[PDB]
Paper text:
The bacterial periplasmic methionine‐binding protein MetQ is involved in the import of methionine by the cognate MetNI methionine ATP binding cassette (ABC) transporter. MetQ, the substrate‐binding protein (SBP) for MetNI,5, 6 is proposed to play a dual role in transport by either binding l‐methionine for delivery to the translocation pathway of MetNI, or by facilitating d‐methionine uptake through the ligand‐free form when complexed to the transporter. Structural studies of SBPs in their ligand‐bound and ligand‐free forms have revealed a hinge‐bending or “Venus‐flytrap” mechanism where two domains of SBPs adopt their open conformation with an accessible binding site in the absence of substrate; substrate binding stabilizes the closed conformation, where the two domains come together and sequester the substrate. In this study, we report the structures of the Neisseria meningitides MetQ in substrate‐free form and in complexes with l‐methionine and with d‐methionine, along with the associated binding constants determined by isothermal titration calorimetry.
With the exception of MetQ found in the MetNIQ complex, the structure of substrate‐free MetQ has not been reported. Since MetQ has a high affinity for l‐methionine, preparation of the apo‐MetQ requires cycles of unfolding and refolding to remove the bound ligand. As an alternative approach, mutation of Asn229 to Ala (N229A) in the binding pocket of the E. coli MetQ was found to substantially decrease the affinity toward methionine, thereby greatly facilitating preparation of the substrate‐free form of MetQ. Despite extensive efforts with both approaches, we could not crystallize the substrate‐free form of E. coli MetQ. Structures of the substrate‐free (N238A) and substrate‐bound N. meningitides MetQ are related by a “Venus‐fly trap” hinge‐type movement of the two domains accompanying methionine binding and dissociation. l‐ and d‐methionine bind to the same site on MetQ, and this study emphasizes the important role of asparagine 238 in ligand binding and affinity. As this asparagine residue interacts with both the α‐amino and α‐carboxyl groups of l‐methionine, mutation to alanine would be expected to significantly impair ligand binding. Three distinct conformational states have been characterized to date for MetQ: one liganded and two ligand‐free forms. A thermodynamic analysis demonstrates that ligand‐free MetQ associates with the ATP‐bound form of MetNI ∼40 times more tightly than does liganded MetQ, consistent with the necessity of dissociating methionine from MetQ for transport to occur.
Residue numbers in the entry: 44 to 284
The structure:
């Protein structure tokens, strides 16, 4: 038996709908433990109550295992609900004007991700040599297109598209509000916040983990993810697949 821990939602659905049967074909059984918060999964992993968890991105994992002194590590990436720039009052990227408004989530990590995206688009230029994970308005070296960024609560972003020219919406709120991820005009190119699986470090070279990694990178899983999770950001190793 391989004991998976996930949050309730997409990451558990991957286990239940595709990964479980794939690993059954390889001699294993899969036991899914669902968690409703983000603190317990790594602790349960570290105490040996889980063999692997799939819920978090690497910035979160790094901070968590540092602060709790856990001997755990990321293993592989999984398809992840993406941060996207969606149409607002304007309907395409080249309609952007000097002074165009962009709504964005106001929590510091998501806001930093928005700034990095706008820098990739060429609408702003961030200072050089900064930590992209903590980018803030102070780090804008040149506002190329004089964009006005309207900071709102993440949950409010789906309703802002009448108020601003473009809206940056988190994948989770895009999904829960009925938006299609494929509607985004521009999806976050960075992989810095794609979700990873995690294990105890002592287990990182184990045979069962090689088989789990294979299952999460198999052709069957890829086709499943392309149908079930259209628009999600794929693991880098899939080559945009």
């Amino acid at each position: 038996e391989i004991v998976f821990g996930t949050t309730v939602g997409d990451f558990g659905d991957m286990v239940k709908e595709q990964i479980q049967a794939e690993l059954e074909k390889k001699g294993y059984t899969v036991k899914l433990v669902e968690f409703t918060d983000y603190v317990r999964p790594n602790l349960a992993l570290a105490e040996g109550e889980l063999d692997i968890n799939v819920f978090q991105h690497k910035p979160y994992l790094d901070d968590f295992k540092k602060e709790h002194n856990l001997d755990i590590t990321e293993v592989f990436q999984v398809p992840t609900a993406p941060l996207g720039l969606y149409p607002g009052k304007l309907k395409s990227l080249e309609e952007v004007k000097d002074g165009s408004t962009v709504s964005a989530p106001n929590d510091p990590s998501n806001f930093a991700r928005v700034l990095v995206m706008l820098d990739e688009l060429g609408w702003i230029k961030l200072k050089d040599g900064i930590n992209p994970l903590t980018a803030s308005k102070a780090d804008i070296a040149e506002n190329l297109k004089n964009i006005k960024i309207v900071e709102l609560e993440a949950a409010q972003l789906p309703r802002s598209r009448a108020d601003v020219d473009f809206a940056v919406v988190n994948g989770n709120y895009a999904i829960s509000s009925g938006m299609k991820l494929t509607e985004a005009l521009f999806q976050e190119p960075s992989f810095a916040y794609v979700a990873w699986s995690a294990v105890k470090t002592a287990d990182k070279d184990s045979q069962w983990l090689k088989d789990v990694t294979e299952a999460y990178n198999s052709d069957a899983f890829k086709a499943y993810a392309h149908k079930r999770f259209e628009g999600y950001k794929s693991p880098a190793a899939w080559n945009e697949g």
